[PDB]
Amino acid sequence: FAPWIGRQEETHDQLSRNLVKRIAATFGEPTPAHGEALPPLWHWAFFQDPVEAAGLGVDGHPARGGFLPPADDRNRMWAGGRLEFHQPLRVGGEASRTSTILRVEEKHGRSGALLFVTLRHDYRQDGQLALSEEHDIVYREPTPPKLGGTEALPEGDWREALEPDPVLLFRYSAVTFNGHRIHYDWPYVTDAEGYPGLVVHGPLIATLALRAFCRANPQARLRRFAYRGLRPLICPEPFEVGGRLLAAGKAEVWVGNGAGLAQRGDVEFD
Amino acid sequence: AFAPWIGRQEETHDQLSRNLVKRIAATFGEPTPAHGEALPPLWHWAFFQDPVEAAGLGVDGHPARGGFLPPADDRNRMWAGGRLEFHQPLRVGGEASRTSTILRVEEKHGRSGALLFVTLRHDYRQDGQLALSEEHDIVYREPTPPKLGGTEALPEGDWREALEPDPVLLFRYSAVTFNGHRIHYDWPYVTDAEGYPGLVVHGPLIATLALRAFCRANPQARLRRFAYRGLRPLICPEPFEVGGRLLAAGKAEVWVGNGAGLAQRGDVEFD
User: Fold this and answer.
1) Which of A143, A160, A186 is the last residue of a domain?
2) CA-CA distances (angstroms) from residue A92 to A1, A32, A37, B15, B45?
3) Which of A44, A185, A234 would you mutate first to test chain B, the one with the most B CBs within 10 A?
4) Residue B199: C-alpha distances to residues A54, A211, B122, B165, B195 (Å)
5) What InterPro entries does the record point to (chain B) (predicted)?
6) Which domain holds residue B20?
7) Within this chain, do residues A99 and A178 fall inside the same structural domain, yes or no?
């Protein structure tokens, strides 16, 4: 049961260039300088509470409890999220993260048991709110990876083709210090879980989807971003990120390939 | 004959930032030193990384052309060993400088031919102090099917730590050192492409475990020198042992191995 509702924790970190350089390298972009804007979604490389091995489950994620309760028989799912952008976080600075457990509601779909937990992350630099983030976590019982169709790649207003490889996936796990083995352990992700190969991270592709929008709408100032996973992408299959404009300051983004869409997302901007 | 690199020098800088320090500590299951406390021995190997964009990376996941070390003409560049000399600890939280000098480049024709031996010196300075000086021995070897027999016997010592590595441990160390060399995490590559039986436990990873154990077994010893030589690759998830034995008032050896032989040995000197 969840009495965790309304629980807060505080975390601090330094947006240190040495680590920003690593994210930059991973994405093949330039390393922002001291005092400049940390690019969208790069903050996910920060505010990491690494867990000692004994606190980890077989899947390499933390089984141990902490801010959130423990999980063994279930498995966390990166269901989605909404980000509200105010100000860039600036490289070099200290920054603070205030986290709140907002909702913990039980639900039912395929496989039935489906506990949804929503977390809010408030990110402050110099006391000043830079970014407010909610993340959807779904605890479910292990089921083999879903089969069946998904939506096709729509035609859109911009598009980028990407050729993943294990080195790209390793660097992104590295930068986020994610120990989830589905992203680098090929014997495990195939034999133990049902996948045909390595899984491209949801955050990694969220970051490429959001970056292709900004690239294509260079005069657009971000306001809001929402993403939702659909079906996992499999390395090394080439895939694609793209989107389209929908209304006044509203755009939709998507990641997918021939197997169909892996992720969809909504953007608001000025 | 090798003047273009002999004497080459370069200075870099880096902050010994706690966020990365927390990830090293988690990897090793240890406490995180506080800001201003000693960086634990050999944790500096995670710092001073100037990583290349993907286009700069070669197939094996290392950078395709580093500009300091002599180019490997499709030869395999091995981490043969090195020597460290500890003067003062590097401190968590602070800026530090690494000055690097290529000391020696020698071609030597032995059994199996001539490979390239290169000796690289690294000098670390923080708050105006010369904290630590180090040398790496690199050995450029022709691409050869992995030789995995172990020649030296794992001895019995004064202490012993049994280790069962797994791909999570190897990933986290590669992560913390932003090492893209994919023989450490990419199982289809390390086997199909390079022909190891499986993933390779990093030499640096092994040395830190080796020195750590000695420290655990000798808590009053303050480090002054450490030398290590890599003997043979270790293969995840082989169970292996780190041990050592005191040899004299401030001398001890350490080693890494298992029933098949020593994977790595080294020498310690302390007060």
Assistant:
1) A143
2) 41, 10, 10, 11, 22
3) A185
4) 22, 34, 28, 10, 10
5) FAS1-like_DH_region, HotDog_dom_sf, Mitochondrial_HTD2
6) 1-144
7) no
Q: Are residues B124 and B22 located together in one domain of the fold?
A: yes
Q: Do B110 and B156 have their domain in common?
A: no
Please check whether residues A17 and A118 belong to one and the same domain.
Answer: yes
One-letter amino acid identity for A108? H
Q: Which of B20, B169, B188 has its CB closest to that of A186?
A: B188
| Residues linked to residue A14 through DSSP beta bridges, in sequence order | A94
Tokens of A28: 């093949």
Radius of gyration of chain B (CA): 18
Report resolution in angstroms: 2.6
Closest by CA to B122, choosing from B50, B44, B190, B67, is: B44
Contact B190, B199 (CB under 8 A): yes
Cβ contacts below 8 Å, chain A against chain B, sum to: 108
DSSP label at A209?
H
**Are B52 and A174 inside 8 Å of each other by CB?**
no
Q: Are A173 and A201 in contact (CB under 8 A)?
A: yes
Same domain, residue pair A132 and A151: no
Nearest CA to A127 out of A48, A27, A9, A12 is that of: A12
